[PDB]
Amino acid sequence: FNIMEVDGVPTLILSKEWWEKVCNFQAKPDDLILATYPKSGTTWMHEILDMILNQLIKTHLPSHLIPPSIWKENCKIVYVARNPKDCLVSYYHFHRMASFMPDPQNLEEFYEKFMSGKVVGGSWFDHVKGWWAAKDMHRILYLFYEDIKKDPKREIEKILKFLEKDISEEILNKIIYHTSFDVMKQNPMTNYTTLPTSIMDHSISPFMRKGMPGDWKNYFTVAQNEEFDKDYQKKMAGSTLTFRT
Amino acid sequence: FNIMEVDGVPTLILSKEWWEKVCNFQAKPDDLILATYPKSGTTWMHEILDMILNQLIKTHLPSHLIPPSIWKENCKIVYVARNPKDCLVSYYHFHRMASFMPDPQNLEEFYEKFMSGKVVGGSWFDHVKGWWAAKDMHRILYLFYEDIKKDPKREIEKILKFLEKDISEEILNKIIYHTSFDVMKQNPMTNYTTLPTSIMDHSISPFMRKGMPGDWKNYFTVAQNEEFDKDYQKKMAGSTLTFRT
Ligand SMILES: Nc1ncnc2c1ncn2[C@@H]1O[C@H](COP(=O)(O)O)[C@@H](OP(=O)(O)O)[C@H]1O
Ligand SMILES: Nc1ncnc2c1ncn2[C@@H]1O[C@H](COP(=O)(O)O)[C@@H](OP(=O)(O)O)[C@H]1O
User: Fold this and answer.
1) From the candidates B60, B95, B127, B138, which is the catalytic residue?
2) How do B76-81 and B140-144 pair as beta strands?
3) Phi then psi for B71, rounded to 5 degrees?
4) Would strands B56-59 and B76-81 be described as parallel, antiparallel, or unpaired?
5) How many whole angstroms separate alpha carbon A24 and alpha carbon A20?
6) Per the residue annotation, which of A60, A93, A95, A127 is the catalytic one?
7) Helix (H) / strand (E) containing B35
8) Phi-psi region of A40 (alpha: psi -120 to 50; beta: other; left: phi over 0)
9) Which helix (H) or strand (E) holds B181?
10) Is the CB of B216 inside 8 Å of chain A's CB atoms?
11) Is residue A83 in contact with ligand 1, taking CB distance under 6 Å?
């Protein structure tokens, strides 16, 4: 059914049990929360932050489960959304490689489940929409996986403004260079290669898979797609939320 | 390489050898030529004519190989085109069942070949374009597989006008009913079931496969498709030729 991915080393926590543990989490103002739907840019965005700095709390929770401490102590929250199609496809190939995960079966089979939101991490729909609703009320930066690919400088530009932090021009690119998909894929300290293949086999699918927006186009039949649109446009009626693909 | 499909019982004739044999074919005016690219509505259109009447010459030849006799004797030529995507998909699943045919291999592999026109029956592109250029110079009725599905009455309406022939309203629908895909599929006299499975196995793919326009959408990845369009738009620059899909 429905749990959530966590990381002492990647594993499944029952959302509730996990929420009970975090329920009354206390937050120092300097703390920096980073939230994302799974396979929506996390490991990437993280290393972008970790770069900018060198306390970062990584959380795949929906907005309505963030410990109030954070709201109260107006913590800086970076949030990253990624278009659903790509997020779906990335998340699919993931189930198809991570042993921790349930069997994805067919790609048509997975879809039905994904749109129903009946997959590890809740509904991507409910997830992204909550956060967007929150960007109105909180110290949240809302970023889009695609816009980063589009303009890494133009994006990190923003992050800095948000953090009051101010880097070099060389130190700047030093970051951009590393947080390119090419460099990061060949990087054992992020690429999750240095892992049990019983846990994650890259010979099936590598965590750092393709990392191109628009890749979904390589898997979604013109039918499955025109299906995805109709179902999407429904769940997103009213939303001011908008994606490049 | 490149031959053509014929029918004492369906078989491969080397296009040239076959054209040499037909080169100086003599044509009585009353004769009715029906031409089509393969898997573009032939067996359907045939039975429509056979119906309307009960001499019909069935030919899968390109316009520039029709024996001049026919031109000279201004014969009535019904021509049927079917949109390429569908035509491709239909023709693909066909190779994948008809033993007479070469191996289609992958569906991506087949595509390359189809667009290159390097498949049994020549280039669908060169085929339909020639016939369209001819509709300007000859007693040719140019029909579209899709328009038929769209409005069989509204289509057969035309055929009659073209033939001067004039049927009943009941005799009319009697025809429409039979030349529906549903009726025809369960019909041994057209459905090619009554055949050697060494020649054609329906347990793989039935000649009367789906018979819905828009079916291709069930096979062509949003990439393969956006690929097909770009390549198509090229070969069809200038053409006034146009398809529903
Ligand atoms: N530096 C980078 N630039 C672009 N995409 C990256 C990246 N690092 C990781 N990704 C992509 O992030 C996705 C996993 O997201 P998360 O970090 O949220 O689990 C993968 O998508 P693909 O599966 O499309 O390749 C991966 O390729
Ligand atoms: N009465 C009918 N109405 C619609 N389509 C028909 C039909 N009879 C045959 N077809 C379709 O004609 C195609 C074969 O064409 P041809 O007669 O030129 O070989 C098949 O397409 P599919 O493979 O898309 O099902 C078949 O389904």
Assistant:
1) B60
2) parallel
3) -55, -65
4) unpaired
5) 8
6) A60
7) strand B32-36
8) alpha
9) helix B181-185
10) yes
11) no
Q: Is A207 annotated as a binding residue?
A: yes
Nearest CA among B129, B161, B115, B162 for reference residue B62: B129
Q: Token match 């429904």: residue?
A: A234
Residue whose tokens read 């498949």: B119
What atom of ligand 2 comes closest to residue B185's alpha carbon? 8
Determine the Cα–Cα distance for residues B48 and B35; give it in Å rounded to an integer. 14
Experimental method: X-ray
Could you tell me the CA-to-CA distances from A52 to A18, A40, A48 in Å, in that order? 29, 20, 6
Residue A10 bridge partners (DSSP): A7
Question: What are the CB-based long-range contacts (under 8 Å, 24+) for B70-73?
Answer: B70/B25, B70/B27, B70/B31, B70/B33, B71/B138, B72/B27, B73/B27, B73/B28, B73/B29, B73/B31
Q: CA dihedral in degrees (A33, A36, A39, A43; nearest 10)?
A: -20
Q: Give the Cα separation of B130 and B122 in Å (integer).
A: 12
Tokens 């659903």 correspond to what residue? A84
User: What are the structural domains of chain A?
Assistant: 1-245 (3.40.50.300)
- Measured in angstroms, the resolution is 3.2
Give the chain A residue whose CA is nearest to the CA of B108.
Answer: A218
